[PDB]
Amino acid sequence: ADNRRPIWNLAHMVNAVAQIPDFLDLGANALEADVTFKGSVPTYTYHGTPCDFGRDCIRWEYFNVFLKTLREYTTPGNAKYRDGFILFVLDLKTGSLSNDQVRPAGENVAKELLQNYWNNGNNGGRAYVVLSLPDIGHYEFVRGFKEVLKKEGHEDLLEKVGYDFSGPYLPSLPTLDATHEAYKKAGVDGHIWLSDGLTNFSPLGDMARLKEAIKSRDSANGFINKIYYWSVDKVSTTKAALDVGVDGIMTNYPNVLIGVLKESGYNDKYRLATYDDNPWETFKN
Ligand SMILES: [Mg+2]
Numbered sequence: 591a592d593n594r595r596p597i598w599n600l601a602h603m604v605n606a607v608a609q610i611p612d613f614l615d616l617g618a619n620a621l622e623a624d625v626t627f628k629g630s631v632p633t634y635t636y637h638g639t640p641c642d643f644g645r646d647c648i649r650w651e652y653f654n655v656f657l658k659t660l661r662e663y664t665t666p667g668n669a670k671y672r673d674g675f676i677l678f679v680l681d682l683k684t685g686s687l688s689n690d691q692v693r694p695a696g697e698n699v700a701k702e703l704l705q706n707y708w709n710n711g712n713n714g715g716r717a718y719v720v721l722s723l724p725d726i727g728h729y730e731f732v733r734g735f736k737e738v739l740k741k742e743g744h745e746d747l748l749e750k751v752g753y754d755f756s757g758p759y760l761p762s763l764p765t766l767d768a769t770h771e772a773y774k775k776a777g778v779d780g781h782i783w784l785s786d787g788l789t790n791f792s793p794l795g796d797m798a799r800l801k802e803a804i805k806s807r808d809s810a811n812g813f814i815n816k817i818y819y820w821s822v823d824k825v826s827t828t829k830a831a832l833d834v835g836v837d838g839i840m841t842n843y844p845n846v847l848i849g850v851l852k853e854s855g856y857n858d859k860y861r862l863a864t865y866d867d868n869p870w871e872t873f874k875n
Contacts, residue, residue, distance in 0.1 A: 696734030
């Protein structure tokens with residue numbers, strides 16, 4: 591009965607486990623963590639310098655420990671369970687991988703999530719996971735990822751998994767068509783998130799890009815389920831993001847969106863997503 595767009599309030603760059611409850615306490619229903627790779631091996635949650643102004647850039651955790659901790663906060667019945675914590679984005683830093691490393695990196699991430707987050711299908715964490723890849727050309731990561739989960743008898747866990755192919759930013763930015771095709775190549779026919787905001791080498795075209803993605807998401811045969819804007823920390827820009835029609839707001843300060851959502855002119859149109867808002871479902875106005 592609620593006609594309002596569910597919004598994902600994504601805590602940006604939450605790479606230390608100590609930071610998780612703090613960001614959820616600020617009101618995030620989601621968080622984002624940067625997954626570093628040593629070869630094909632996902633190793634740390636760690637962003638590194640430079641990072642957003644006003645942020646310490648070098649908080650980190652071992653990937654497995656981070657995933658295990660996410661499990662704690664997202665397993666019903668767990669002492670640490672937060673029913674408000676419904677999704678996380680893994681910003682997979684595969685950008686330096688040689689081609690041979692890409693598929694195994696997907697397998698490795700799948701294995702990590704399987705073991706540490708989903709506990710091999712044994713009362714795993716319930717949050718949705720967005721695999722964010724920085725290259726549409728890394729679709730074999732997704733193929734490798736899916737293979738592992740299916741081969742291990744946990745294809746059903748793919749219900750919890752979504753994808754965001756975002757980049758590369760050189761030689762040129764990806765078109766939507768190119769992105770859509772990359773999903774097709776990954777065997778991905780839904781659970782598609784699109785991220786925007788991080789590139790602005792052409793503000794006119796970036797304005798255009800976002801609107802194009804919004805139009806695409808809302809088109810009859812659209813492939814994008816959710817659009818999230820990296821990042822937004824001010825009330826004004828938070829409102830602007832909501833107003834242009836994004837589904838998710840990546841932010842250093844989740845408390846900002848919480849406040850905006852409570853405001854007149856916002857509380858009638860937008861609301862904080864809950865677990866029952868399928869992140870893979872395109873919002874129909
Ligand atoms: Mg990141």
